[PDB]
């Protein structure tokens, strides 16, 4: 179908809670080669967030089970095989997205906000792949995640206000990457504190819509609190 039809089908699949369908629509749209508008970029993210998040959720449940199964190796065996199957679905999905990002979304992004958005997403997705990697490839997947976030972080520092939600959300996710994935709480705490403090100083300076910004500021501070004691 044409772009408009696809976009329409996508919104219909959203209403129906049929996310695999939504993702497939928004994949084709992306594949037409033209820079996505905010409505389209957002539909694509919603779709993939839910498609990937379900398999992350399922993975954590099964993986856990495979862990507390010190009893019957047998059961343990099944739990491992189920986990492996689910990791495989999960890797396929991240790989689709990571590829949509390298071929279209990053190169066609003409505006700082969108470019930071897609670099963050790249970091998010390499990070999801690190969560289920071992041990060989892990090092290199972790590095790709970090390179994305860093690059996104530099652009957001030059081009966006510290209270911009895309900037603060990058800070939130990057800081959690440092804490959970590089096991590096000093770097996590510092990034988060700085990001919080700089948004606080821009409040003194001053629109536009600080409700979302302040919720992300709260999430940053709740993490520092947790990570101190």
């Amino acid at each position: 179908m044409d772009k408009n039809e696809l976009v329409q089908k996508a919104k219909l699949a959203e209403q129906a809670e049929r996310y695999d369908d939504m993702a497939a629509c928004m994949k084709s749209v992306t594949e037409q080669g033209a820079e996505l508008s905010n409505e389209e970029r957002n539909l694509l993210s919603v779709a993939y967030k839910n498609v990937v998040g379900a398999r992350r959720s399922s993975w954590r449940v099964v993986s856990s089970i495979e862990q507390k199964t010190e009893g019957a190796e047998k059961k343990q065996q099944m739990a491992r095989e189920y986990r492996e199957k689910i990791e495989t679905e999960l890797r396929d999905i991240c790989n689709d997205v990571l590829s949509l990002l390298e071929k279209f979304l990053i190169p066609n992004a003409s505006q700082a906000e969108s470019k930071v958005f897609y670099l963050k997403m790249k970091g998010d997705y390499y990070r999801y792949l690190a969560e289920v990697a071992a041990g060989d490839d892990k090092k290199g997947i972790v590095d790709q995640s970090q390179q994305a976030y860093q690059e996104a972080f530099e652009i957001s520092k030059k081009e966006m206000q510290p209270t911009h939600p895309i900037r603060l959300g990058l800070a939130l996710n990057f800081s959690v990457f440092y804490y959970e994935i590089l096991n590096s709480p000093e770097k996590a705490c510092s990034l988060a504190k700085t990001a919080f403090d700089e948004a606080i100083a821009e409040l003194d300076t001053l629109e536009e819509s600080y409700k979302d910004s302040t919720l992300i500021m709260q999430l940053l501070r709740d993490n520092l609190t947790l990570w101190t004691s």
């Binding site: 967030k49 998010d124 895309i166 992300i216 999430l219």
Partner: peptide, 10 residues
């Protein structure tokens, strides 16, 4: 709403 698409790690 907006924060949903942002896939926050919370």
């Amino acid at each position: 709403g907006l924060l949903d698409x942002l896939d926050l790690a919370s």
